Design a protein around this ligand. Structure first.
Ligand SMILES: *[C@@H]1O[C@H](CO)[C@@H](O[C@@H]2O[C@H](CO)[C@@H](O)[C@H](O)[C@H]2NC(C)=O)[C@H](O)[C@H]1NC(C)=O
Ligand SMILES: *[C@@H]1O[C@H](CO)[C@@H](O[C@@H]2O[C@H](CO)[C@@H](O)[C@H](O)[C@H]2NC(C)=O)[C@H](O)[C@H]1NC(C)=O
Ligand SMILES: *[C@@H]1O[C@H](CO)[C@@H](O[C@@H]2O[C@H](CO)[C@@H](O)[C@H](O)[C@H]2NC(C)=O)[C@H](O)[C@H]1NC(C)=O
Ligand SMILES: *[C@@H]1O[C@H](CO)[C@@H](O[C@@H]2O[C@H](CO)[C@@H](O)[C@H](O)[C@H]2NC(C)=O)[C@H](O)[C@H]1NC(C)=O
Ligand SMILES: *[C@@H]1O[C@H](CO)[C@@H](O[C@@H]2O[C@H](CO)[C@@H](O)[C@H](O)[C@H]2NC(C)=O)[C@H](O)[C@H]1NC(C)=O
Ligand SMILES: *[C@@H]1O[C@H](CO)[C@@H](O[C@@H]2O[C@H](CO)[C@@H](O)[C@H](O)[C@H]2NC(C)=O)[C@H](O)[C@H]1NC(C)=O
Ligand SMILES: *[C@@H]1O[C@H](CO)[C@@H](O[C@@H]2O[C@H](CO)[C@@H](O)[C@H](O)[C@H]2NC(C)=O)[C@H](O)[C@H]1NC(C)=O
Ligand SMILES: *[C@@H]1O[C@H](CO)[C@@H](O)[C@H](O)[C@H]1NC(C)=O
Ligand SMILES: *[C@@H]1O[C@H](CO)[C@@H](O)[C@H](O)[C@H]1NC(C)=O
Ligand SMILES: *[C@@H]1O[C@H](CO)[C@@H](O)[C@H](O)[C@H]1NC(C)=O
Ligand SMILES: *[C@@H]1O[C@H](CO)[C@@H](O)[C@H](O)[C@H]1NC(C)=O
Ligand SMILES: *[C@@H]1O[C@H](CO)[C@@H](O)[C@H](O)[C@H]1NC(C)=O
Ligand SMILES: *[C@@H]1O[C@H](CO)[C@@H](O)[C@H](O)[C@H]1NC(C)=O
Ligand SMILES: *[C@@H]1O[C@H](CO)[C@@H](O)[C@H](O)[C@H]1NC(C)=O
Ligand SMILES: *[C@@H]1O[C@H](CO)[C@@H](O)[C@H](O)[C@H]1NC(C)=O
Lengths: 167, 420, 99, 198
């Protein structure tokens, strides 16, 4: 029985007649060593998605790499709850989110220029001078015009199923 | 049994009798809406052909079937953050309440953030979070906005609503005493503000009791959040089905790819692998399609939640039963796992009396109509009162207007109109 | 990223392009330690065979099976395998073998 | 980027068609993706098998395309219904719905056509400048509690005025601006002033 994975010690009490274990996906979970009757867990060799955080190629060819849901171990290194971010400088100052990373962390290309990562700002802090006998009434106003854009239709495609399949 | 369609209750209708409420109750209702769904991501290559070069090479013969599924799942994952952003990130600034909770007797300590917690969530939010509860290329992405940030956004929206009414939604947050804010909310439903001011203590006590009842309901009725628990369950079920699909043979001699490769020569292994690839690719396409349809439903729900947030929390809704049963006064947002919960505070008429009515009153031959409200009679004297609350006033020339004469209005009765 | 998007220009944003996997460094081969050769000689090269109605069955257990001789010998007129391939047989264990 | 919502729609449809066209290059297990190369090389007993493989692959590709088009069409239909709702309750009328027709108090909207879409220009009134005024829920005159018919009572520190809620425009407090209900012993926070009788 072959495969690839990390073989580790286990506390799984296999019965004397059982030789292999299986997971929900029917893959091998653990094996009994044919020479020494101990149970070894098989953990697939660590893995995760790889995301590239980049400004457009019309600006710079510098990129940052996010290794999703992993520790900064097996892989200017910033560990976030989104994964291990390598190549982006960690900046204490918050800004508006530009290129989102996840878990509250966003990245952008800023200053000499490089990719930075930071916790995104939610908005300016502005306390209200509330009291039980004070009301604020506007004395002036502005007329503003905003633009709201909505899709209405999509391209009316038509496919000749017979000619497409059997031209 | 045959189900009952509610209790039967006939209305004592007649052409000259009107029922006007004499008392009222302030009620708080809970509306729960899904906002987002789990941001799943599937590595189509590792899922179909895990650690097998031969399977991957056979998979390449299907072209873009793999990468278009990665694209569809990416699109869903992105719109889940768009949905969260549209529902909660509607305020440009982070507002905070004053240290003194002098809100006219209205107790908000159960919906405002608790500074003593590791995450500044409200008591009710804590109750909500306590009710809602692999290695095959299937991963879950974190949301862009963490639970702490969502709690901060709901805190900003709640503090804005409490301290500035609707002004923070339209523009700047304009401070106003809470009692005056409620006075405007009452005028907006056709009840004169003096009703609020005269009964402010009663209204505040009813509000506080309604909130306590909300806490008892959420703390005792597990099914209250079923609309959100089902969403979590649906995504878990979808992933479990996908994982279970790896155990299927799809016509192959074995579901385990390594057992095929270790036993058959390429001329036969390629056929068995093609069978497994076809089965697993069809399984992925089914999963992705189900995720796209469910995501469209979630998006529609998120749009509804955003509409309610804007036209319910930030303003005042004139739309009947849009923001709960009754005449809407105000609503308070609360965050929840993968969703939003609205606490709608509404005015509901509570007690009524049978009064005799008339469309108009004759004085000197002129037909007098109310400027606001209706004419009522307790059997001996005629009064004018607001439609939604019994508050009899003497009929005067400053309450009514004259149009036409007694020979036109059907059902007009004789009385006198006092001239101040 | 450029290969993932099938373009030489990448727009501003974050793209998922591949998957990190720590590759194995070495193979680990484990088998029960046993030097007995499976008695394939006295099964095929036996002097006398049984009638097909009373076909003789032999049980092979606890021995190293050298299948090389079999597919390498050219005495056999018919050699067909089902469910498994001859080439991948020498590197494969079995609970029991029946002849 | 202002029109990204419409450009993305064009791109999505182009991508779907480009994917469909690229799907013609796949083998799906056949000896060749080109149907004529199969027919020119194999006899019917084998050509039919290779063709069945290509038909299965291309039919599955079409089903995927059609499903994606139906889902995208449902999304577009929902968006179109929203656009129609805004057109009716925004351009043709006046919206009382907060933030339905842009941030601020809605005044009017103007439709504009766009490729595969509609653009609304929403003209709204937004309060711009404010002052801190002292307020009171009611004013006592002769023991009667007077409430504003419209607007609120404000004080600049020496005189009480009544003004509309959304725009500072102080007016003298008179019997034609307020109404009487109850007395000074009921309203919490009522202050003393005078009410002018025209
Ligand atoms: C309300 O604000 C507007 C601008 O926001 C004021 O208009 C400006 O007035 C100044 C005079 O102090 C002029 O120099 C500017 O050119 C005006 N701007 C525009 C666009 O016309 C307006 O005067 C303010 N109203 C009040 C009553 O203060
Ligand atoms: C309107 O209804 C409320 C409750 O629905 C009444 O408040 C109660 O009044 C009784 C006296 O009749 C008290 O004993 C209760 O303790 C009150 N309850 C609360 C919560 O305050 C109120 O009196 C009614 N008003 C009218 C005019 O009928
Ligand atoms: C608002 O209500 C909360 C409880 O719903 C009040 O907090 C309680 O205060 C009393 C003291 O009078 C304590 O004995 C309770 O244990 C507290 N309970 C909780 C849950 O904190 C709070 O004081 C009320 N606020 C106002 C202004 O009345
Ligand atoms: C209808 O309302 C009028 C006004 O309140 C009542 O008239 C008053 O009745 C009381 C008796 O409780 C007298 O003390 C007042 O002097 C009366 N005022 C006037 C102006 O008549 C009348 O009795 C009510 N009728 C009914 C059937 O309830
Ligand atoms: C209300 O009052 C008017 C007059 O003030 C009543 O009109 C009378 O109608 C009768 C029947 O047609 C005539 O005979 C009288 O001459 C009318 N009065 C006058 C002054 O011309 C009317 O009937 C009264 N309605 C009620 C319901 O009492
Ligand atoms: C509050 O507003 C009133 C009304 O204008 C002010 O009273 C006027 O003050 C001016 C001084 O600039 C005098 O010339 C007027 O004769 C006053 N009129 C009246 C009716 O008193 C008052 O001074 C303002 N107070 C503050 C603190 O701004
Ligand atoms: C508003 O004016 C009234 C008088 O019109 C004040 O009432 C006085 O209250 C004190 C304290 O209870 C009594 O000793 C006086 O006798 C009351 N006056 C009268 C004429 O009865 C009231 O206190 C004033 N309120 C404010 C906030 O100034
Ligand atoms: C790239 O950036 C330059 C500005 O330096 C701009 O003029 C050019 O149009 C941009 N090209 C694209 C494809 O965006
Ligand atoms: C990574 O590993 C270190 C110890 O090697 C541990 O302290 C840290 O918490 C880990 N981080 C994550 C995200 O698992
Ligand atoms: C950011 O601030 C923390 C203190 O909260 C400090 O420990 C850290 O070194 C700072 N990092 C940078 C890059 O300024
Ligand atoms: C009003 O009249 C109807 C007549 O059927 C009666 O049933 C109802 O109880 C009356 N309302 C009150 C408050 O008495
Ligand atoms: C109400 O109806 C009755 C009979 O249907 C009629 O006698 C009476 O005059 C009517 N009242 C009015 C005000 O129309
Ligand atoms: C079979 O056994 C005989 C002994 O009778 C021997 O001569 C012959 O060479 C053997 N053949 C093989 C293939 O072992
Ligand atoms: C009202 O008073 C508060 C006191 O904190 C102040 O911050 C605010 O700026 C004042 N309003 C204006 C318009 O200046
Ligand atoms: C407003 O609050 C202050 C202290 O918080 C209090 O002294 C004052 O009397 C209150 N005013 C009213 C009208 O309740």
């Amino acid at each position: 029985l072959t495969g690839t994975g990390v073989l580790t010690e286990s506390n799984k009490k296999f019965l004397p007649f059982q030789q292999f274990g299986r997971d929900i996906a029917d893959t091998t979970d653990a094996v009994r060593d044919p020479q020494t009757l101990e149970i070894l867990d098989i953990t697939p060799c660590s893995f995760g998605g790889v995301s590239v955080i980049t400004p457009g190629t019309n600006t710079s060819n510098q990129v940052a790499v996010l290794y999703q849901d992993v520790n900064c171990t097996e892989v200017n290194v910033f560990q976030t709850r989104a994964g291990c971010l390598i190549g982006a400088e960690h900046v204490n100052n918050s800004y508006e989110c530009d290129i989102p990373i996840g878990a509250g962390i966003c990245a952008s290309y800023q200053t000499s220029q490089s990719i930075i990562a930071y916790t995104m700002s939610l908005g300016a802090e502005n306390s209200v001078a509330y009291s039980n006998n004070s009301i604020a009434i506007p004395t002036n106003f502005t007329i503003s015009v905003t633009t709201e854009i909505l899709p209405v239709s999509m391209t009316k495609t038509s496919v000749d199923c017979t000619m497409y399949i059997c031209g | 049994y045959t189900m009952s369609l509610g209790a039967e209750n006939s209305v004592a209708y007649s052409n000259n009798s009107i029922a006007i409420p004499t008392n009222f109750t302030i009620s708080v209702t809970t509306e729960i809406l899904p906002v987002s769904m789990t941001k799943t991501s599937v590595d189509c290559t590792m899922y179909i052909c895990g650690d097998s070069t031969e399977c991957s090479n056979l998979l390449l013969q299907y072209g873009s079937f793999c990468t278009q599924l990665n694209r569809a799942l990416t699109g869903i994952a992105v719109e889940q953050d768009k949905n969260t952003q549209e529902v909660f990130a509607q305020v440009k600034q982070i507002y905070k309440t004053p240290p003194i909770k002098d809100f006219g007797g209205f107790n908000f300590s159960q919906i405002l953030p608790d500074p003593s917690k590791p995450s500044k969530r409200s008591f009710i939010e804590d109750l909500l979070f306590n009710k809602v509860t692999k290695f095959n290329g299937l991963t879950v992405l974190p949301p862009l906005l963490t639970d702490e940030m969502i709690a901060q956004y709901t805190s900003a929206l709640l503090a804005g609503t409490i301290t500035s009414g609707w002004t923070f939604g339209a523009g700047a947050a304009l401070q106003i005493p809470f009692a005056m804010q409620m006075a405007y909310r009452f005028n907006g439903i056709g009840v004169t503000q003096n009703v609020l001011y005269e009964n402010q203590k009663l209204i505040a006590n009813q509000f506080n009791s309604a909130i306590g009842k909300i806490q008892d309901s959420l703390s005792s009725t597990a099914s209250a959040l079923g609309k959100l628990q089902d969403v979590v369950n649906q995504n878990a079920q979808a992933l479990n089905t996908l994982v279970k699909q790896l155990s299927s043979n799809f016509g192959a001699i074995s579901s385990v790819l390594n057992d095929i490769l270790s036993r058959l020569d390429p001329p036969e292994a390629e056929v068995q692998i093609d069978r497994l690839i076809t089965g697993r690719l069809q399984s992925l396409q089914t999963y992705v399609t189900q995720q796209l349809i469910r995501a469209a439903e979630i998006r529609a729900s998120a749009n509804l939640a955003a509409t309610k947030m804007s036209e319910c929390v930030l303003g005042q809704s004139k739309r009947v039963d849009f923001c709960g049963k009754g005449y809407h006064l105000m609503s308070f947002p609360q965050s929840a796992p993968h969703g939003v919960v609205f606490l709608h505070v509404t005015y509901v008429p509570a007690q009524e009396k049978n009064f005799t009515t008339a469309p108009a009153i004759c004085h000197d031959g002129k037909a007098h109509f109310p400027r606001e409200g209706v004419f009522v009679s307790n059997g001996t004297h005629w009064f004018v009162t607001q439609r939604n609350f019994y508050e009899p006033q003497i009929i005067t020339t400053d309450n009514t207007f004259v149009s036409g004469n007694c020979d036109v209005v059907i059902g007009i009765v004789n009385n006198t109109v006092y001239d101040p | 990223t450029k290969c993932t998007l099938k373009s030489f220009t990448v727009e501003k944003g974050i793209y998922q392009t591949s998957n990190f996997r720590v590759q194995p460094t070495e193979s680990i081969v484990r088998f029960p330690n046993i030097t007995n050769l499976c008695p394939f000689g006295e099964v095929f090269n036996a002097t006398r065979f049984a009638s097909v109605y009373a076909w003789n069955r032999k049980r092979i257990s606890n021995c190293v099976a050298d299948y090389s001789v079999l597919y390498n010998s050219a005495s056999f007129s018919t050699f067909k395998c089902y469910g498994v391939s001859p080439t991948k047989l020498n590197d494969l264990c079995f609970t029991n073998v029946y002849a």
